[PDB]
Protein backbone atom coordinates (compact mmCIF):
# COMPACT_ATOMS: atom_id res chain seq x y z
CA UNK A 1 0.00 0.00 0.00
CA UNK A 2 3.09 2.17 0.37
CA UNK A 3 4.21 3.66 -2.95
CA UNK A 4 7.94 4.34 -3.35
CA UNK A 5 8.31 4.82 -7.13
CA UNK A 6 9.84 8.09 -8.26
CA UNK A 7 11.02 8.84 -4.73
CA UNK A 8 7.38 9.36 -3.74
CA UNK A 9 8.28 8.66 -0.10
CA UNK A 10 9.85 12.14 0.12
CA UNK A 11 8.10 13.88 -2.80
CA UNK A 12 4.51 13.58 -1.50
CA UNK A 13 5.27 16.21 1.17
CA UNK A 14 4.93 19.01 -1.40
CA UNK A 15 1.28 18.19 -2.15
CA UNK A 16 -1.97 18.82 -0.29
CA UNK A 17 -3.86 15.67 0.68
CA UNK A 18 -6.71 16.56 -1.70
CA UNK A 19 -4.32 16.36 -4.68
CA UNK A 20 -1.82 13.53 -4.06
CA UNK A 21 -3.77 11.10 -6.26
CA UNK A 22 -3.71 13.46 -9.23
CA UNK A 23 0.00 14.09 -8.64
CA UNK A 24 0.71 10.35 -8.37
CA UNK A 25 -0.89 9.92 -11.81
CA UNK A 26 1.32 12.59 -13.39
CA UNK A 27 4.30 11.07 -11.59
CA UNK A 28 3.52 7.70 -13.18
CA UNK A 29 3.27 9.46 -16.55
CA UNK A 30 6.74 10.93 -16.01
CA UNK A 31 8.63 7.78 -14.99
CA UNK A 32 7.06 5.00 -17.11
CA UNK A 33 19.65 2.61 -17.13
CA UNK A 34 18.90 1.24 -20.59
CA UNK A 35 22.13 -0.81 -21.16
CA UNK A 36 21.60 -4.20 -19.52
CA UNK A 37 17.84 -4.10 -18.86
CA UNK A 38 15.06 -5.89 -20.71
CA UNK A 39 12.37 -4.11 -22.72
CA UNK A 40 8.74 -4.60 -21.67
CA UNK A 41 5.48 -4.83 -23.63
CA UNK A 42 2.88 -3.72 -21.10
CA UNK A 43 1.04 -0.86 -22.84
CA UNK A 44 -2.07 -2.87 -23.73
CA UNK A 45 -2.46 -4.68 -20.40
CA UNK A 46 -1.99 -1.48 -18.36
CA UNK A 47 -4.87 0.11 -20.29
CA UNK A 48 -7.38 -2.02 -18.38
CA UNK A 49 -6.41 -0.98 -14.86
CA UNK A 50 -6.09 2.56 -16.23
CA UNK A 51 -9.72 2.32 -17.38
CA UNK A 52 -10.86 1.59 -13.82
CA UNK A 53 -8.80 4.55 -12.62
CA UNK A 54 -10.78 6.66 -15.09
CA UNK A 55 -14.07 5.14 -13.93
CA UNK A 56 -13.15 5.68 -10.27
CA UNK A 57 -13.12 9.45 -10.87
CA UNK A 58 -16.63 9.42 -12.37
CA UNK A 59 -19.76 9.88 -10.28
CA UNK A 60 -21.35 6.69 -8.87
CA UNK A 61 -24.39 7.37 -11.06
CA UNK A 62 -22.39 7.39 -14.31
CA UNK A 63 -19.84 4.71 -13.36
CA UNK A 64 -22.06 1.98 -14.85
CA UNK A 65 -21.46 3.40 -18.35
CA UNK A 66 -17.74 2.46 -18.17
CA UNK A 67 -17.72 -1.03 -19.68
CA UNK A 68 -15.20 -3.13 -21.62
CA UNK A 69 -16.73 -5.01 -24.56
CA UNK A 70 -15.10 -7.58 -26.82
CA UNK A 71 -15.25 -6.72 -30.50
CA UNK A 72 -16.74 -8.95 -33.19
CA UNK A 73 -13.31 -10.33 -34.10
CA UNK A 74 -12.90 -11.60 -30.50
CA UNK A 75 -9.34 -10.24 -30.73
CA UNK A 76 -9.66 -6.84 -29.00
CA UNK A 77 -11.17 -5.45 -25.82
CA UNK A 78 -13.08 -2.23 -26.49
CA UNK A 79 -12.96 0.33 -23.68
CA UNK A 80 -16.33 2.08 -23.78
CA UNK A 81 -17.97 4.96 -21.92
CA UNK A 82 -21.57 4.77 -23.03
CA UNK A 83 -21.64 4.37 -26.80
CA UNK A 84 -18.12 5.76 -27.37
CA UNK A 85 -15.02 3.62 -27.87
CA UNK A 86 -12.22 5.62 -26.27
CA UNK A 87 -9.51 2.98 -26.90
CA UNK A 88 -8.86 -0.67 -27.76
CA UNK A 89 -6.23 -3.24 -26.82
CA UNK A 90 -5.17 -6.38 -28.67
CA UNK A 91 -5.50 -9.52 -26.56
CA UNK A 92 -2.28 -10.98 -28.00
CA UNK A 93 -0.43 -7.83 -26.88
CA UNK A 94 -2.07 -7.99 -23.45
CA UNK A 95 -0.72 -11.54 -23.13
CA UNK A 96 2.64 -10.65 -24.77
CA UNK A 97 2.47 -13.57 -27.20
CA UNK A 98 3.25 -14.00 -30.88
CA UNK A 99 0.69 -13.22 -33.57
CA UNK A 100 0.21 -16.81 -34.79
CA UNK A 101 -0.59 -17.94 -31.24
CA UNK A 102 -4.13 -19.26 -30.81
CA UNK A 103 -6.57 -17.64 -28.37
CA UNK A 104 -9.34 -20.05 -27.44
CA UNK A 105 -12.65 -18.26 -26.95
CA UNK A 106 -13.75 -17.53 -23.39
CA UNK A 107 -17.13 -17.55 -21.74
CA UNK A 108 -18.37 -14.16 -20.58
CA UNK A 109 -17.60 -15.15 -16.99
CA UNK A 110 -14.05 -16.09 -17.97
CA UNK A 111 -13.61 -12.80 -19.84
CA UNK A 112 -14.61 -10.92 -16.68
CA UNK A 113 -12.10 -12.89 -14.62
CA UNK A 114 -9.49 -12.39 -17.35
CA UNK A 115 -9.92 -8.62 -17.12
CA UNK A 116 -9.90 -8.65 -13.31
CA UNK A 117 -6.58 -10.51 -13.30
CA UNK A 118 -5.24 -7.95 -15.80
CA UNK A 119 -6.45 -5.18 -13.49
CA UNK A 120 -4.42 -6.51 -10.57
CA UNK A 121 -1.36 -7.11 -12.76
CA UNK A 122 -1.59 -3.56 -14.10
CA UNK A 123 -1.93 -1.97 -10.66
CA UNK A 124 1.05 -3.90 -9.30
CA UNK A 125 3.19 -2.87 -12.27
CA UNK A 126 1.95 0.73 -12.21
CA UNK A 127 2.25 1.62 -8.51
CA UNK A 128 4.87 -0.99 -7.50
CA UNK A 129 7.53 -1.37 -10.21
CA UNK A 130 9.89 -2.71 -7.53
CA UNK A 131 8.19 -6.13 -7.58
CA UNK A 132 9.10 -6.88 -11.20
CA UNK A 133 12.67 -5.57 -10.92
CA UNK A 134 13.29 -8.03 -8.10
CA UNK A 135 11.73 -11.02 -9.86
CA UNK A 136 8.97 -12.14 -12.16
CA UNK A 137 8.04 -14.49 -9.30
CA UNK A 138 7.62 -11.67 -6.77
CA UNK A 139 5.19 -9.93 -9.12
CA UNK A 140 3.29 -13.18 -9.74
CA UNK A 141 2.97 -14.21 -6.10
CA UNK A 142 1.51 -10.75 -5.45
CA UNK A 143 -1.28 -11.32 -7.99
CA UNK A 144 -1.96 -15.02 -7.32
CA UNK A 145 -1.84 -14.18 -3.60
CA UNK A 146 -4.29 -11.30 -3.96
CA UNK A 147 -7.39 -11.95 -1.86
CA UNK A 148 -9.98 -11.01 -4.49
CA UNK A 149 -8.22 -12.94 -7.27
CA UNK A 150 -7.91 -16.11 -5.18
CA UNK A 151 -11.54 -15.82 -4.09
CA UNK A 152 -12.82 -15.13 -7.61
CA UNK A 153 -10.83 -17.99 -9.14
CA UNK A 154 -12.08 -20.49 -6.57
CA UNK A 155 -15.63 -19.15 -6.81
CA UNK A 156 -15.64 -19.88 -10.55
CA UNK A 157 -13.75 -23.20 -10.65
CA UNK A 158 -14.38 -24.85 -7.24
CA UNK A 159 -17.22 -22.89 -5.62
CA UNK A 160 -17.62 -25.21 -2.61
CA UNK A 161 -13.87 -25.53 -1.94
CA UNK A 162 -12.18 -22.97 0.28
CA UNK A 163 -8.83 -21.68 -1.05
CA UNK A 164 -7.22 -22.85 2.21
CA UNK A 165 -8.84 -26.28 1.83
CA UNK A 166 -6.60 -28.90 3.50
CA UNK A 167 -4.71 -31.49 1.47
CA UNK A 168 -6.25 -34.95 1.07
CA UNK A 169 -3.82 -37.86 0.93
CA UNK A 170 -3.45 -39.75 -2.35
CA UNK A 171 -4.99 -43.22 -2.82
CA UNK A 172 -3.95 -44.96 -6.04
CA UNK A 173 -7.20 -46.45 -7.34
CA UNK A 174 -6.31 -46.09 -11.04
CA UNK A 175 -5.32 -48.70 -13.60
CA UNK A 176 -2.56 -48.04 -16.12
CA UNK A 177 -5.09 -47.28 -18.87
CA UNK A 178 -6.78 -44.67 -16.66
CA UNK A 179 -3.44 -42.98 -15.92
CA UNK A 180 -2.71 -42.76 -19.65
CA UNK A 181 -6.17 -41.30 -20.25
CA UNK A 182 -5.50 -38.62 -17.61
CA UNK A 183 -2.00 -37.82 -18.91
CA UNK A 184 -3.42 -35.39 -21.46
CA UNK A 185 -4.53 -32.92 -18.75
CA UNK A 186 -0.96 -32.46 -17.42
CA UNK A 187 1.22 -32.28 -20.55
CA UNK A 188 1.48 -36.00 -21.26
CA UNK A 189 2.52 -37.05 -17.74
CA UNK A 190 0.72 -38.51 -14.74
CA UNK A 191 1.87 -37.13 -11.39
CA UNK A 192 -0.70 -37.42 -8.56
CA UNK A 193 0.32 -34.18 -6.82
CA UNK A 194 -0.01 -31.98 -9.94
CA UNK A 195 -2.50 -33.71 -12.26
CA UNK A 196 -5.51 -31.69 -11.13
CA UNK A 197 -4.38 -28.08 -10.62
CA UNK A 198 -6.41 -27.07 -13.70
CA UNK A 199 -9.57 -29.07 -12.91
CA UNK A 200 -12.62 -27.44 -11.36
CA UNK A 201 -15.79 -29.03 -10.03
CA UNK A 202 -19.24 -27.90 -8.90
CA UNK A 203 -22.22 -29.78 -7.49
CA UNK A 204 -25.80 -29.02 -8.52
CA UNK A 205 -28.28 -30.85 -6.27
CA UNK A 206 -25.45 -33.08 -5.08
CA UNK A 207 -24.22 -34.04 -8.57
CA UNK A 208 -20.66 -33.12 -9.52
CA UNK A 209 -19.66 -31.72 -12.91
CA UNK A 210 -16.03 -31.25 -13.92
CA UNK A 211 -14.38 -28.61 -16.08
CA UNK A 212 -10.95 -27.24 -16.96
CA UNK A 213 -9.57 -23.75 -16.32
CA UNK A 214 -9.29 -21.69 -19.49
CA UNK A 215 -5.70 -21.63 -20.85
CA UNK A 216 -5.43 -17.82 -20.92
CA UNK A 217 -6.44 -17.74 -17.26
CA UNK A 218 -3.89 -20.45 -16.50
CA UNK A 219 -1.29 -18.55 -18.53
CA UNK A 220 -2.04 -15.15 -16.96
CA UNK A 221 -1.74 -16.43 -13.39
CA UNK A 222 1.28 -18.73 -13.61
CA UNK A 223 3.17 -18.09 -16.87
CA UNK A 224 2.74 -14.42 -17.83
CA UNK A 225 5.89 -12.42 -18.61
CA UNK A 226 5.89 -8.73 -19.59
CA UNK A 227 9.36 -8.90 -21.17
CA UNK A 228 9.51 -8.65 -24.96
CA UNK A 229 12.26 -11.30 -24.92
CA UNK A 230 9.90 -13.85 -23.36
CA UNK A 231 7.36 -13.59 -26.20
CA UNK A 232 8.43 -16.91 -27.83
CA UNK A 233 8.55 -18.66 -24.43
CA UNK A 234 5.19 -17.13 -23.47
CA UNK A 235 3.64 -18.50 -26.66
CA UNK A 236 5.24 -21.88 -25.98
CA UNK A 237 3.54 -22.12 -22.59
CA UNK A 238 0.18 -21.03 -24.02
CA UNK A 239 0.33 -23.56 -26.86
CA UNK A 240 0.99 -26.32 -24.33
CA UNK A 241 -1.92 -25.12 -22.17
CA UNK A 242 -4.20 -25.08 -25.21
CA UNK A 243 -3.14 -28.64 -26.06
CA UNK A 244 -4.16 -29.93 -22.63
CA UNK A 245 -7.40 -27.94 -22.90
CA UNK A 246 -8.42 -29.30 -26.31
CA UNK A 247 -7.35 -32.82 -25.32
CA UNK A 248 -9.57 -32.74 -22.23
CA UNK A 249 -12.69 -31.68 -24.13
CA UNK A 250 -12.12 -34.20 -26.92
CA UNK A 251 -11.90 -37.07 -24.39
CA UNK A 252 -14.20 -35.56 -21.75
CA UNK A 253 -16.65 -38.45 -22.08
CA UNK A 254 -13.91 -40.76 -20.76
CA UNK A 255 -11.94 -38.42 -18.49
CA UNK A 256 -14.84 -37.15 -16.37
CA UNK A 257 -15.61 -40.78 -15.46
CA UNK A 258 -12.11 -41.16 -14.01
CA UNK A 259 -12.18 -37.72 -12.36
CA UNK A 260 -15.46 -38.56 -10.61
CA UNK A 261 -14.08 -41.76 -9.09
CA UNK A 262 -11.05 -39.88 -7.75
CA UNK A 263 -13.29 -37.06 -6.51
CA UNK A 264 -15.50 -39.49 -4.57
CA UNK A 265 -12.56 -41.38 -3.03
CA UNK A 266 -10.79 -38.19 -1.89
CA UNK A 267 -13.59 -36.56 0.14
CA UNK A 268 -15.20 -34.72 -2.80
CA UNK A 269 -12.03 -32.88 -3.79
CA UNK A 270 -9.13 -33.18 -6.19
CA UNK A 271 -6.81 -31.21 -3.87
CA UNK A 272 -4.73 -34.37 -3.50
CA UNK A 273 -1.29 -34.60 -1.92
CA UNK A 274 1.35 -37.19 -1.11
CA UNK A 275 3.43 -37.25 2.09
CA UNK A 276 2.21 -33.77 2.95
CA UNK A 277 2.84 -31.96 -0.36
CA UNK A 278 0.39 -31.04 -3.11
CA UNK A 279 0.36 -28.77 -6.17
CA UNK A 280 -3.30 -29.48 -7.01
CA UNK A 281 -4.38 -26.06 -5.72
CA UNK A 282 -5.83 -23.70 -8.32
CA UNK A 283 -3.48 -20.86 -7.30
CA UNK A 284 -1.68 -19.73 -4.15
Amino acid sequence: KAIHMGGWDKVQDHFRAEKKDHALEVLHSIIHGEPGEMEVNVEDINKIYAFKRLQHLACPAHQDLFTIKMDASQTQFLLMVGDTVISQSNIKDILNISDDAVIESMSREERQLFLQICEVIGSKMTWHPELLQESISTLRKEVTGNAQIKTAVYEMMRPAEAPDHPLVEWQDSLTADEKSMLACINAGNFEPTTQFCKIGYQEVQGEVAFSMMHPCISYLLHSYSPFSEFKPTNSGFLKKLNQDYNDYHAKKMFIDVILEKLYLTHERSLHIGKDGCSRNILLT
Binding site: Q74, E104, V204, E207, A209, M253, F254, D256, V257
Partner: protein, 178 residues
Amino acid sequence: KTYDYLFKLLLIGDSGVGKTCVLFRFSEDAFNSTFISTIGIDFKIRTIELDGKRIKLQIWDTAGQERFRTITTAYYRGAMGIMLVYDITNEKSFDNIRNWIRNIEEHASADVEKMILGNKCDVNDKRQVSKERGEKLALDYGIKFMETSAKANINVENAFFTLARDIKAKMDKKLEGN
Protein backbone atom coordinates in the same frame (compact mmCIF):
# COMPACT_ATOMS: atom_id res chain seq x y z
CA LYS B 1 -18.34 -49.74 -12.92
CA THR B 2 -20.76 -47.08 -11.73
CA TYR B 3 -21.07 -45.71 -15.27
CA ASP B 4 -19.11 -45.96 -18.51
CA TYR B 5 -19.40 -42.64 -20.40
CA LEU B 6 -20.42 -39.05 -19.71
CA PHE B 7 -22.54 -37.41 -22.44
CA LYS B 8 -22.88 -33.65 -21.96
CA LEU B 9 -26.09 -32.28 -23.49
CA LEU B 10 -27.46 -28.75 -23.89
CA LEU B 11 -31.10 -27.65 -23.83
CA ILE B 12 -31.44 -24.72 -26.23
CA GLY B 13 -34.45 -22.55 -27.02
CA ASP B 14 -36.34 -19.41 -26.19
CA SER B 15 -37.52 -18.73 -22.66
CA GLY B 16 -40.99 -20.04 -21.82
CA VAL B 17 -41.06 -22.96 -24.28
CA GLY B 18 -40.56 -25.52 -21.50
CA LYS B 19 -36.84 -26.39 -21.36
CA THR B 20 -36.75 -26.66 -17.56
CA CYS B 21 -39.97 -28.71 -17.48
CA VAL B 22 -38.65 -31.08 -20.16
CA LEU B 23 -35.44 -31.54 -18.15
CA PHE B 24 -37.24 -32.24 -14.87
CA ARG B 25 -39.66 -34.61 -16.59
CA PHE B 26 -36.80 -36.63 -18.08
CA SER B 27 -34.53 -36.57 -15.03
CA GLU B 28 -36.95 -36.74 -12.08
CA ASP B 29 -40.29 -37.72 -13.71
CA ALA B 30 -41.81 -34.54 -12.33
CA PHE B 31 -44.01 -31.63 -13.40
CA ASN B 32 -44.96 -28.71 -11.10
CA SER B 33 -46.67 -29.61 -7.76
CA THR B 34 -43.78 -29.69 -5.24
CA PHE B 35 -42.10 -26.81 -7.04
CA ILE B 36 -38.32 -26.38 -7.04
CA SER B 37 -37.49 -23.17 -8.87
CA THR B 38 -34.11 -23.27 -10.61
CA ILE B 39 -32.14 -20.92 -8.43
CA GLY B 40 -28.95 -22.18 -10.03
CA ILE B 41 -30.07 -25.60 -11.29
CA ASP B 42 -27.68 -25.41 -14.23
CA PHE B 43 -27.91 -29.12 -15.05
CA LYS B 44 -29.55 -32.41 -14.10
CA ILE B 45 -28.28 -35.94 -14.69
CA ARG B 46 -29.92 -39.20 -15.71
CA THR B 47 -28.00 -42.45 -16.14
CA ILE B 48 -29.35 -44.73 -18.88
CA GLU B 49 -28.22 -48.06 -20.38
CA LEU B 50 -27.35 -48.59 -24.05
CA ASP B 51 -25.92 -51.85 -25.44
CA GLY B 52 -24.78 -52.91 -21.97
CA LYS B 53 -22.95 -49.62 -21.33
CA ARG B 54 -24.31 -47.19 -18.74
CA ILE B 55 -24.33 -43.57 -19.94
CA LYS B 56 -24.58 -40.62 -17.56
CA LEU B 57 -26.48 -37.93 -19.44
CA GLN B 58 -25.46 -34.54 -18.00
CA ILE B 59 -28.13 -32.20 -19.38
CA TRP B 60 -27.60 -28.44 -19.08
CA ASP B 61 -30.35 -25.83 -18.92
CA THR B 62 -28.53 -22.49 -19.10
CA ALA B 63 -29.80 -21.06 -22.40
CA GLY B 64 -31.62 -17.76 -21.99
CA GLN B 65 -29.82 -17.06 -18.71
CA GLU B 66 -27.66 -14.49 -20.52
CA ARG B 67 -27.49 -16.20 -23.91
CA PHE B 68 -29.63 -14.24 -26.37
CA ARG B 69 -27.41 -15.16 -29.32
CA THR B 70 -24.53 -13.62 -27.42
CA ILE B 71 -22.99 -17.08 -27.67
CA THR B 72 -19.57 -17.99 -29.01
CA THR B 73 -17.52 -21.20 -29.27
CA ALA B 74 -17.07 -21.45 -25.49
CA TYR B 75 -20.72 -22.25 -24.73
CA TYR B 76 -20.71 -25.41 -26.89
CA ARG B 77 -17.24 -26.61 -25.86
CA GLY B 78 -17.50 -30.19 -24.62
CA ALA B 79 -21.12 -30.64 -25.73
CA MET B 80 -21.90 -33.95 -27.42
CA GLY B 81 -25.59 -33.27 -28.12
CA ILE B 82 -28.01 -30.34 -28.38
CA MET B 83 -31.78 -30.44 -27.84
CA LEU B 84 -33.47 -27.49 -29.57
CA VAL B 85 -36.88 -26.65 -28.09
CA TYR B 86 -39.70 -24.43 -29.28
CA ASP B 87 -43.29 -24.00 -28.15
CA ILE B 88 -46.10 -25.00 -30.49
CA THR B 89 -48.13 -22.46 -28.51
CA ASN B 90 -45.76 -19.78 -29.85
CA GLU B 91 -44.78 -19.31 -33.50
CA LYS B 92 -42.24 -16.63 -32.54
CA SER B 93 -40.25 -19.29 -30.67
CA PHE B 94 -40.52 -21.66 -33.65
CA ASP B 95 -39.11 -19.11 -36.10
CA ASN B 96 -36.27 -18.29 -33.70
CA ILE B 97 -35.13 -21.91 -34.09
CA ARG B 98 -33.55 -20.96 -37.42
CA ASN B 99 -31.34 -18.47 -35.54
CA TRP B 100 -30.31 -20.96 -32.85
CA ILE B 101 -29.34 -23.43 -35.59
CA ARG B 102 -27.04 -21.04 -37.46
CA ASN B 103 -25.53 -20.02 -34.12
CA ILE B 104 -24.72 -23.72 -33.63
CA GLU B 105 -23.22 -24.50 -37.05
CA GLU B 106 -20.94 -21.45 -36.83
CA HIS B 107 -19.90 -21.90 -33.18
CA ALA B 108 -20.26 -25.59 -32.23
CA SER B 109 -18.36 -28.63 -33.45
CA ALA B 110 -19.54 -30.28 -36.65
CA ASP B 111 -20.00 -33.73 -35.06
CA VAL B 112 -22.42 -32.45 -32.39
CA GLU B 113 -25.73 -34.30 -32.59
CA LYS B 114 -28.82 -32.08 -32.71
CA MET B 115 -32.54 -32.71 -32.30
CA ILE B 116 -35.61 -30.44 -32.42
CA LEU B 117 -38.44 -30.63 -29.88
CA GLY B 118 -41.83 -29.03 -30.43
CA ASN B 119 -42.92 -29.00 -26.81
CA LYS B 120 -46.48 -28.72 -25.43
CA CYS B 121 -48.08 -31.28 -27.77
CA ASP B 122 -50.96 -31.30 -25.24
CA VAL B 123 -52.21 -27.74 -25.91
CA ASN B 124 -54.09 -28.02 -29.20
CA ASP B 125 -56.54 -25.20 -28.42
CA LYS B 126 -53.70 -22.64 -28.41
CA ARG B 127 -51.56 -24.24 -31.14
CA GLN B 128 -49.82 -21.84 -33.53
CA VAL B 129 -47.37 -24.12 -35.41
CA SER B 130 -48.42 -27.21 -37.36
CA LYS B 131 -46.60 -30.48 -36.80
CA GLU B 132 -45.84 -30.64 -40.53
CA ARG B 133 -44.16 -27.24 -40.24
CA GLY B 134 -42.04 -28.76 -37.48
CA GLU B 135 -40.92 -31.72 -39.58
CA LYS B 136 -40.29 -29.48 -42.60
CA LEU B 137 -37.77 -27.26 -40.82
CA ALA B 138 -36.05 -30.34 -39.42
CA LEU B 139 -36.02 -32.01 -42.83
CA ASP B 140 -34.38 -28.83 -44.14
CA TYR B 141 -31.37 -29.14 -41.82
CA GLY B 142 -31.24 -32.95 -41.79
CA ILE B 143 -31.78 -33.38 -38.05
CA LYS B 144 -34.43 -35.44 -36.28
CA PHE B 145 -37.66 -33.91 -34.95
CA MET B 146 -40.43 -34.93 -32.56
CA GLU B 147 -43.31 -33.23 -30.77
CA THR B 148 -43.35 -33.49 -26.98
CA SER B 149 -45.32 -32.50 -23.88
CA ALA B 150 -43.52 -32.42 -20.54
CA LYS B 151 -46.88 -32.14 -18.78
CA ALA B 152 -48.46 -35.27 -20.29
CA ASN B 153 -45.07 -37.06 -20.48
CA ILE B 154 -45.35 -37.66 -24.23
CA ASN B 155 -42.21 -38.40 -26.28
CA VAL B 156 -39.80 -37.04 -23.64
CA GLU B 157 -38.15 -40.39 -22.89
CA ASN B 158 -37.74 -41.59 -26.48
CA ALA B 159 -36.44 -38.19 -27.62
CA PHE B 160 -33.47 -38.28 -25.23
CA PHE B 161 -32.87 -41.98 -25.92
CA THR B 162 -32.69 -41.30 -29.66
CA LEU B 163 -30.22 -38.43 -29.20
CA ALA B 164 -28.04 -40.49 -26.85
CA ARG B 165 -28.15 -43.50 -29.18
CA ASP B 166 -27.03 -41.25 -32.04
CA ILE B 167 -24.18 -39.86 -29.93
CA LYS B 168 -23.05 -43.35 -28.90
CA ALA B 169 -23.20 -44.51 -32.53
CA LYS B 170 -20.72 -42.02 -33.98
CA MET B 171 -18.55 -42.18 -30.85
CA ASP B 172 -18.37 -45.96 -31.31
CA LYS B 173 -17.30 -45.83 -34.97
CA LYS B 174 -14.69 -43.21 -34.09
CA LEU B 175 -13.11 -45.75 -31.72
CA GLU B 176 -12.31 -48.15 -34.59
CA GLY B 177 -8.84 -46.72 -35.01
CA ASN B 178 -9.96 -43.13 -35.63
